[PDB]
Paper text:
The most widespread of these mechanisms employs a “controller” (C) protein encoded by a gene downstream of its own promoter, and usually co-transcribed with the endonuclease (R) gene as a single transcriptional unit. The C-protein binds at various sites within the C/R promoter to regulate transcription of its own gene and the associated endonuclease gene. Unusually, in the RM system Esp1396I, the C-protein also represses the MTase (M) gene by binding to the promoter at the transcriptional start site, denoted OM where the C/R genes and the M gene are transcribed convergently from different promoters.
The mutant proteins Y37F, Y37A, T36A, S52A and R46A were crystallized (the latter in two different space groups) and the crystals diffracted X-rays to a resolution of 1.5–2.0 Å. The KD for the R46A mutant was ∼30 fold greater than that of the wild type, showing a much weaker interaction with the OM operator site, and consistent with a key DNA-binding role for this arginine side chain. The ΔΔG for R46A is significantly larger (8.5 kJ mol−1), and that for the T36A mutation must be larger still, since we could not measure any DNA binding activity of this mutant protein. Both R46 and T36 of C.Esp1396I are seen in crystal structures of DNA-protein complexes to interact directly with the base pairs involved in sequence recognition, specifically with the G and C bases, respectively, of the C-box recognition sequence GTC. Five of the monomers in the asymmetric unit are observed to be in loop conformation I but the sixth more closely resembles that of conformation II, which is almost identical to that in the DNA-protein complex with the 19OM operator site. The SO4 based interaction observed in the high-resolution wild type structure is also observed in the Y37A, S52A and monoclinic R46A structures.
Numbering used by the authors:
A (entry chain B), B (entry chain A): 2 to 79
């Protein structure tokens, strides 16, 4: 897993926890099942753009805020 | 179910999410299985004191902090 794949997983999980959400709440709100959410948060290699859009909606985060949090994580830690 | 039983379950879940843990992470660290953790989060009626001590250990919360969070929930919301 490259730094980018680990940090896409990292930012999904970080926002989910910031929001007080379980994996099962995010599964329900993203229309992707709980094993799929757990899998993505471990390795985001095969997460598709369509599924990332569903997860941003289920986190109630805009795409701009999600990608800004990702860029900050890359800049300050890669 | 009474406010007490609901609030034991609420406080367990609240600390679990504050610790960034899934139900499987907590099951593993408490030595109680995932279905047992999920059942007591729904309804703590049959949670024993010994299982509660295993859970507080798996959350790495002291019994004093656990019970102080429960009293603050009861006072503020009941
Ligand atoms: Na996908
Ligand atoms: Na559950």
């Amino acid at each position: 897993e490259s730094f980018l794949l680990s940090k896409v997983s990292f930012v999904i999980k970080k926002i989910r926890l910031e929001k007080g959400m379980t994996q099962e709440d995010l599964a329900y709100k993203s229309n992707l099942d709980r094993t799929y959410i757990s899998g993505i948060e471990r390795n985001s290699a095969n997460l598709t753009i369509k599924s990332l859009e569903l997860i941003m909606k289920g986190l109630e985060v805009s795409d701009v805020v999600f990608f800004e949090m990702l860029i900050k994580e890359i800049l300050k830690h890669d």
